[PDB]
Design a protein around this ligand. Structure first.
Ligand SMILES: [Ca+2]
Ligand SMILES: [Ca+2]
Ligand SMILES: [Zn+2]
Ligand SMILES: [Zn+2]
Lengths: 237, 237
């Protein structure tokens, strides 16, 4: 398989393979069996605010989710990013669904790497601010059945049936450029993300969530993920 | 031919094809026949400080170069980036020489676009700070005969024969990711650069200059450019 670490904002409680009995936020080191979990409200179509950092002076890998007028879920996990994730990566988004429908609209996304040339000697960035996912955005290598455009939206489903987004839809949003990580020059590359989603209520028990992965520079949709495999896992372990 | 706009930090006076009598800074719209030139010092092996902006609030493609203990050579040309430079681009550096030698050591490089979702609404970036050109940098699709690494350097020559870098060699340094420009979402993307270089005196009348282009998303070394074509124009017109 391909080595990949994601932040599952899972919206079906996958009762048989490791997730809790509630729709949560998790974090995944190569395994859909997660490393932390945290309770999530699951509001209807409301916007977004999720935020993921990792320094290596404090080596916790963090994430929060708060709708505006809602609380935050600090689902931070301590893991050693030294030996778990390859030197040059390809960041981006992954959502899926299967037999249940939900909206996986992303409207904005950002990033900032800062990797330790000689720690003070002017580290390297890849910062962006994608508030405007257009029709013909071409630094995205969006796999699967992802769409974009028509508005400022990134639609990681098969959409526009009145926003009832055609279940067993999987879509990935691999960003174009690579970033140095593994450790080697050490690994304080304090990568940030802003993950402003929209999960509309389709009045249909909405369930499978969007992830935010960091993968190897090569990828595909692994062995089918039309459902609980969450777009990036080949296997349910 | 490839639609291209360069900014020349020329060291060779090309009287025949149209450069003035001294080593100059200039600016190019689809031709080596520049629009404006200015006085540039051309010292020996010293370092670096160049700077290129374009604010469409002011439509000046301004450019200065300073050695420390030197002046600032403004070569700003009125150009409307509306109709001259493609809807998605591929930025990068370009150095070349032919029949004369020069060292074209680049030691750091940067960028910052800021492009107008809805003018205030959180312009998109692509900021990087390459102070750490590695041996195996892979967000560069460096063309020609450019090299990198072994130290923090981006050697746009064939070099290391005591760094007297083996005349008639060309190498460009195309960055990986594109930028939306042409106008379409209007063109206030104030793209900045910082271009810390080092032109060693080879004891051989140092000549052919380094550039800074914003080309099409495809390019090459055009039709052979071992010399006056400055790495990027197919023809001298
Ligand atoms: Ca699920
Ligand atoms: Ca020339
Ligand atoms: Zn889960
Ligand atoms: Zn010139």
């Amino acid at each position: 398989a391909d080595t990949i670490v994601a932040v599952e904002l899972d919206t079906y409680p996958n009762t048989d393979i490791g997730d809790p009995s509630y729709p949560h936020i998790g974090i995944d080191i190569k395994s859909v069996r997660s490393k932390k979990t945290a309770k999530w409200n699951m509001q209807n179509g409301k916007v977004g605010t999720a935020h993921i950092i990792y320094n290596s002076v404090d080596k916790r890998l963090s994430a929060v989710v708060s709708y505006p007028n809602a609380d935050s879920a600090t689902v931070s996990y301590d893991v050693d990013l030294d030996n778990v994730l390859p030197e040059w990566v390809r960041v981006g988004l992954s959502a899926s669904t299967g037999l249940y429908k939900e909206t996986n609209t992303i409207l904005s996304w950002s990033f900032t790497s800062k990797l330790k040339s000689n720690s003070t000697h002017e580290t390297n960035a890849l910062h962006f601010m994608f508030n405007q996912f257009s029709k013909d955005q071409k630094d995205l290598i969006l796999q699967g059945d992802a769409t974009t455009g028509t508005d400022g939206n990134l639609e990681l489903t098969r959409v526009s049936s009145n926003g009832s987004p055609q279940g067993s839809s999987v879509g990935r949003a691999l960003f174009y450029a690579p970033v140095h990580i593994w450790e080697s020059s050490a690994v304080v590359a304090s990568f940030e993300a802003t993950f402003t989603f929209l999960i509309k209520s389709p009045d249909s028990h909405p369930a499978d969530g969007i992830a935010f992965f960091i993968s190897n520079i090569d990828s595909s949709i692994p062995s089918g993920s039309t459902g609980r495999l969450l777009g990036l896992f080949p296997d349910a372990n």
